[PDB]
Design a protein around this ligand. Structure first.
Ligand SMILES: Cc1cccc(-c2ccc([C@@H]3[C@@H](CO)N4CCCCN(S(=O)(=O)c5ccccc5C(F)(F)F)C[C@@H]34)cc2)c1C
Length: 959
């Protein structure tokens, strides 16, 4: 009947555990639509995906489609205010973002479930009448430039664009996708281009309804959402744009049998092997490329990685199909190299072709296909409920590739066993079709080429024909065997009934000297999974730099030894996480609860009886040295956060201190360390999920008994369980710590206004003030003043203390950012005074909606509890309590808080600043609002002297 709708789809196949309701349809103008109705959801969400992207950029205006993405947020005919969209979401508990790929531009948001329609209306105008204001165009070009700048010294981005640069230059694959100030302004200016014209030209040409997919999720009925979407999106005009296709591969014959030697910024050794392949997307029900990726990339007994590890040549390997665009794809194998491996790349590649040859020898394996199929089937059935914003964005993209009825299952369920396709793809993994890239600092000075956009330095050689032949003649290596049946595949999915004494929050069910056990049986999600979290306390994990190094290497070596065994468990939905902390060790086991005790028992047994392979020890130690050194290449703003974390924590070892001590770590000393670390411990655990109190008590005691049997562990004394405190800053003080980033030509800054110990009152004063200023700070500091791509504000919480923080990465010097942030804070004092009383309550309700947002998957609820436990506050009802108090706050209360704690002349202002200067700054001391004059800062010359010159805060009292 309805003329606005071209069709309604049939039942949209979903998991029987999914309680959400789905309708799919195609609009008259061709928009493909999925509607998701979830009456429980706290946040509603919508996303739109356009099947156009950087591959469609005009060759003379690189990055135009990425630039157009940024511009749609900045105003439309119906809603002209540059920030009406941001502001509307902020005051209704929303967020938004977008990304541009070669073939897609994806826009998405979430918001309070009551304001879906208000958000969606503003959002629809992006695709109807965008302004492309000239003042916004001039300002936003800078945001794009600093984003590129951030990427210039990043080894991944350099490799990403280097690949495009070494293929057919006539192919759109070569296009620079990001854009920068040169491609978007300075160069188009000297060629007479009116960019606002090209934006409107491009938007009008390609933003056509026939290339769009929309997904909307909210509490409304499926019928109500249907009316809503036709109301807002039928207006979008249909220009029947043909969908771009790229049938000719970017890598032709002249681009094969090629070797590239590349100089990295970080000290890394990597080998990249690539084969051009046809587009396998159409074969999604068969998934031939993923079958091969599963086998080549396997890490278990008999695998290619296993032999390469034993020879001491590589440490990690990943492989499989890599997307390109419609009409072309890649198959890749990525290994990191040891020092020895760098000298044996030829042999390493031979082993690769030997393993591939084994797969040809044995032919396709239906049992392998069956196993992959069964695992994906289990995965889909018990998939965790997704956060709405990410869910709509994902679905919006794949609406372009699968029938409406299959969108939810297309990427999970497998139907066809197709050995013809497996051999077809397998026939393409041959030496005559290969491309090899080596990344090592050993090529420094030996390169003869330079990549235009990032400056990557590299050398290109043809692979010698005799070397190709050795690879082509790869025999069978008897150390390569297909994997055996995966015995970690779960079979028991029974959901145990809720016990009578079950509780809404974690209960303390064991409180001994050795262990504190918090337990909760799942009463929400009812999936056959569980989370097992353990914190191991030992003073010897962080006593000095040397011991910290050894705690790290111990767990790295242990994970290395378990890798072959645990890989099967990971494929089977059973994964673990094990790393050292400043307080000891952290262990998490997540996944299907069926075979979970088996993996946990194997981990603890291995810890307590660990034998170190000397060859593995030397290799991992070398990698760890490089990892420490490679911090020099992180981004300025991350340095600033690192430095501030060192300044404000009672105890903290620097990367330099760790580097020095790493040389004094001998194999004998490590062998002695491990038994000393395990000799005395305290264990605090959260066991949460599809398990009962008896099972949980048994799991916790199994861990203890294993440690007692093999490591003779005894309890710690309670006075030994000590937490670190935060430095207490003086009233009206201001300290600055200054450092230089020697890799990146940007500067970074973090500003911390310390308030007081966490407290129900002090917590919500800060959080509410943070909410009020969140959007304005971004609008003022980024979109208006265009200081940098990275502009952040919000609460900082550490060691029981809290405060307000600003983080900026910019080309301008830090002392300038200091004033602009100081100028902004006064704007916020007036803005709070002038704002209406309902505008204020609007923020209160926005913060409330955020805090009370219910977790949708077990892992998220577990995280909430775990944060209460590791912080030793144990405030499991915090959300209800704090929101209740928040609602009673008044505009008067926030002004007093600002006047007392944050204002420039506040009697209790505690300000500490970290300035990370850019690579090229030697030193460092209109239309914009006026900044207050600031005092003379006390320049921190030594972090140790700084800390001992000041008091230390107390620790928070447990609930
Ligand atoms: C000159 C030349 C020749 C041959 C190849 C490359 C190359 C191409 C591309 C790269 C990119 C680089 C960023 O551009 N990325 C870094 C981290 C590893 C991430 N991935 S990946 O890990 O290989 C991968 C990606 C997608 C799907 C599956 C996989 C899989 F795991 F299955 F293999 C690619 C790698 C590097 C060199 C280059 C640059």
């Amino acid at each position: 009947n309805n003329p606005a709708i071209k069709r309604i789809g049939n039942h949209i196949t979903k998991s029987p555990e999914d309680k959400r309701e789905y309708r799919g349809l195609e609009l008259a103008n061709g928009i493909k639509v999925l509607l998701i109705s979830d009456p429980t959801t706290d946040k509603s969400s919508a996303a739109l995906d356009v099947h156009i992207g950087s591959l469609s950029d005009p060759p003379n205006i690189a990055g135009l489609s990425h630039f157009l993405q940024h511009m749609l947020f900045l105003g439309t005919k119906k809603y002209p205010k540059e920030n009406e969209y941001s502001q509307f979401l902020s005051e209704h508990a929303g967020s938004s973002n977008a990304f541009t790929s070669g073939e897609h531009t994806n826009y998405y948001f979430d918001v309070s479930h009551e304001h879906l329609e208000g958000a969606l209306d503003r959002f629809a105008q992006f695709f109807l009448s965008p302004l492309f204001d000239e003042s916004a165009k001039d300002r936003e070009v800078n945001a794009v430039d600093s984003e590129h700048e951030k990427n210039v010294m990043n080894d991944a981005w350099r490799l990403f664009q280097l690949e495009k640069a070494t293929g057919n230059p006539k192919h759109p694959f070569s296009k620079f996708g990001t854009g920068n100030k040169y491609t978007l302004e300075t160069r188009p200016n000297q060629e007479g281009i009116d960019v606002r014209q090209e934006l409107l030209k491009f938007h009008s040409a390609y933003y056509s309804s026939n290339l769009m997919a929309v997904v909307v999720l909210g509490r409304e009925s499926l019928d109500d959402l249907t009316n809503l979407v036709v109301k807002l999106f039928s207006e979008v005009e249909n220009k029947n744009v043909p969908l771009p296709e790229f049938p000719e591969h970017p890598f032709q014959e002249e681009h094969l049998k090629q070797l590239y030697k590349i100089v990295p910024i970080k000290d890394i050794r990597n080998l990249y092997v690539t084969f051009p392949i046809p587009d396998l997307q159409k074969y999604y029900k068969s998934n031939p490329g993923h079958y091969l990726g599963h086998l080549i990339g396997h890490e278990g007994p008999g695998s290619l990685l296993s032999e390469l590890k034993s020879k001491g040549w590589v440490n990690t390997l990943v492989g499989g199909q890599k997307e390109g665009a419609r009409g072309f794809m890649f198959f890749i194998i990525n290994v990191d190299l040891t020092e020895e491996g760098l000298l044996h790349v030829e042999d390493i590649i031979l082993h690769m072709f030997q393993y591939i040859q084994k797969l040809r020898a044995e032919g396709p394996q239906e049992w392998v296909f069956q196993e992959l199929k069964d695992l994906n089937a289990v995965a889909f059935r018990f998939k965790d409920k997704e956060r709405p914003r990410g869910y709509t964005s994902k679905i919006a993209g794949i609406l372009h590739y699968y029938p409406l009825e299959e969108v939810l299952t297309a990427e999970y369920l497998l139907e066809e066993f197709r050995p013809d396709l497996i051999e077809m793809v397998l026939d393409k993994l041959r030496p005559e079709n290969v491309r090899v890239a080596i990344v090592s600092k050993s090529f420094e000075g030996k390169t003869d080429r330079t990549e235009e956009w990032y400056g990557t330095q590299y050398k290109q050689e043809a692979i010698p024909d005799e070397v190709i032949k050795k690879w082509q003649n790869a025999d069978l290596n008897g150390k390569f065997k297909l994997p055996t049946k995966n015995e970690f595949i779960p079979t028991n999915f029974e959901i145990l009934p809720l016990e009578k004494e079950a509780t809404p929050y974690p209960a303390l069910i064991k409180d001994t000297a050795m262990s504190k056990l918090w337990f909760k049986q799942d009463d929400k999600f009812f999936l056959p999974k569980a989370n097992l979290n353990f914190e191991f306390f030992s003073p010897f994990a962080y006593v000095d730099p040397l011991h910290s190094n050894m705690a790290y290497l111990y767990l790295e070596l242990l994970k290395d030894s378990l890798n072959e065994y645990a890989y099967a468990a990971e494929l089977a939905g059973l994964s673990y996480d094990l790393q050292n902390t400043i307080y000891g060790m952290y262990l998490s086991v997540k996944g299907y609860n069926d075979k979970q005790p088996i993996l946990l028992k194997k981990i603890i047994e291995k810890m307590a009886t660990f034998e170190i392979d000397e060859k593995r020890f030397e290799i991992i130690k070398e990698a760890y040295m490089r990892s420490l050194n490679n911090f020099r290449a992180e981004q300025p703003h991350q340095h600033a956060m690192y430095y501030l974390r060192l300044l404000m924590t009672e105890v903290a070892w620097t990367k330099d201190e760790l580097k020095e001590a790493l040389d004094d770590v001998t194999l004998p000393r490590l062998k002695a360390f491990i038994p000393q670390l395990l000799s005395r411990l305290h264990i605090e655990a959260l066991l949460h999920g599809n398990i009962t109190k008896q099972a949980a008590l048994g799991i916790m005691q199994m861990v203890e008994d294993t440690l007692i049997e093999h490591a003779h562990t005894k309890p710690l004394l309670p006075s030994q369980l000590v937490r670190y405190r935060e430095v207490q800053l003086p009233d009206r003080g201001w300290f600055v710590y200054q450092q230089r980033n020697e890799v990146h030509n940007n500067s970074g800054i973090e500003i911390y206004y310390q308030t007081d110990m966490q407290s129900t009152s002090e917590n919500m004063f800060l959080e509410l003030f943070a909410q009020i200023i969140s959007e304005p700070a971004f609008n003022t500091l980024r979109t208006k003043e265009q200081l940098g791509y990275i502009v952040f504000s919000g609460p900082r919480r550490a060691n029981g203390i809290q405060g307000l923080r600003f983080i900026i990465q910019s080309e301008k010097p830090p002392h300038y950012l200091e004033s602009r942030v100081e100028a902004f804070l006064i704007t916020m004092e007036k803005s709070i005074e002038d704002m209406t009383e309902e505008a204020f309550q609007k923020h209160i309700q926005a913060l409330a909606i955020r805090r009370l947002d219910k977790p949708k998957k077990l892992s998220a609820e577990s995280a909430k509890y775990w944060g209460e436990i590791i912080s030793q506050q144990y405030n499991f009802d915090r959300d209800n309590t704090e929101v209740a108090y928040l609602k009673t706050l008044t505009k008067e209360d926030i002004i007093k808080f600002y006047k007392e704690m944050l204002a420039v002349d506040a009697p209790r202002r505690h300000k500490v600043s970290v300035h990370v200067l850019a690579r090229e700054m030697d030193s460092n001391p209109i239309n914009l609002s006026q900044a207050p004059a600031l005092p003379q800062p006390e320049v921190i010359q030594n972090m140790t002297e700084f800390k001992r010159g000041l008091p230390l805060f107390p620790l928070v009292k447990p609930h």
